[PDB]
């Protein structure tokens, strides 16, 4: 899923690009 198991990498985010491919940076600042 878009839920990373890393504490920061692909978890915290600023833009959709910080997330795994096809995942989005949500309004709370986390990928989802």
């Amino acid at each position: 899923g878009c839920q990373s198991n890393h504490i920061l990498k692909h978890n915290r985010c600023k833009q959709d690009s910080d997330c795994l491919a096809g995942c989005v940076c949500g309004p709370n600042g986390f990928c989802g």
């Binding site: 198991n5 920061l8 709370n28 986390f30």
Partner: protein, 307 residues
């Protein structure tokens, strides 16, 4: 008789009453960035935490009025897990970027790297100080649960099948059992402390557990996708329920109680075991082992380091 639950929440640490879980959690310390790991030394009135963005482990004195945050250990690239040895008075942690397990005194002094090989994504770490064993997980390319002496001895893999994202890990000190949560296979299992007699507790449908703790007959865990704290019976996996919800970003968790850090004799006695530097718990008689900071030689007498 449910306990207070202490948990990290990235921006703060919180305490919630497991008997009044619907009510608001109280903030222990605030103004954090990515607080992840948390533990305590109840009899010293200390709470420890890691902040993976500030690359540090810090502590606070929770019986004092002033709510002060003191840096204990800095320069930690990804301190994903920590445990407090409430008996030998030591701090243990994992680092998933430098791929290490390390120990220090409670003030951060005399740091010693214990393991630095065959680690990839080390994460949870739990201690059995009166037995001198430490336990940890690694969710990397070879996922596993391991145990070793708290002195760095006798490292062994105890679980390496049916395992992928072992995030949570705790011990039942009354029943002498290990419990863990796997966030990819979506269950909670238990075993003996050597990994034998593995049994399922919660068989499935745990979407992303991160950390696990225990009190009396109840398991408690945080889940990253539900943003909540759940509980179930530690034998049957039944009575599954949601203790506390709408959590910003729940992380590590403990039952916050003196009863979870049972009093025992420190085998180091009153003279630090005659050790010049570190006196670490050990699983073989006399149940302590002297040690030195990283790179520093222990003389043949087994007590004194080369200053």
């Amino acid at each position: 008789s449910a306990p207070l639950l202490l948990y990290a929440n990235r921006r703060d640490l919180r305490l919630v009453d497991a008997t009044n879980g619907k009510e608001n959690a109280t903030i222990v310390v605030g103004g954090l960035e990515d607080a992840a790991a948390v533990d305590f030394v109840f009899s010293h009135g200390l709470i420890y935490w890691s902040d993976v963005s500030e690359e540090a482990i810090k502590r606070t004195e929770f019986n004092k009025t002033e709510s002060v945050q003191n840096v204990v250990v800095s320069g930690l690239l990804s301190p994903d897990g920590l445990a407090c040895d409430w008996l030998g008075e030591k701090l243990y942690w994992t680092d998933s970027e430098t791929n290490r397990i390390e120990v220090s005194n409670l003030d951060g002094s005399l740091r010693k790297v214990l393991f630095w090989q065959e680690l990839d994504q080390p994460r949870a770490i739990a201690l059995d100080p009166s037995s001198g064993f430490m336990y940890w997980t690694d969710w990397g390319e070879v996922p596993k649960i391991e145990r070793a002496g708290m002195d760095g001895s006798s490292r062994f893999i105890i679980i390496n099948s049916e395992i992928y994202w072992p995030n949570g890990l705790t011990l039942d000190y009354e029943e002498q059992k290990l419990y863990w949560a796997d966030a990819k296979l979506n269950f909670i299992h238990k075993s003996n402390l050597d990994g034998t007699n593995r049994q399922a507790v919660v068989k499935g449908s745990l979407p992303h557990p991160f950390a696990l703790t225990l009190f009396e007959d109840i398991l408690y865990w945080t889940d990253w996708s539900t943003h909540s704290i759940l509980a179930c019976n530690k034998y049957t996996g039944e009575g599954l329920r949601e203790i506390h919800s709408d959590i910003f970003s729940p992380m590590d968790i403990h039952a916050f109680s003196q009863q979870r850090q049972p009093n025992a004799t420190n085998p180091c006695g009153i003279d630090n075991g005659g050790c010049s530097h570190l006196c670490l718990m050990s699983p073989v008689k006399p149940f302590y082992q002297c040690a030195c900071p990283t790179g520093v030689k222990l003389l043949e007498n087994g007590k004194t380091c080369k200053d």
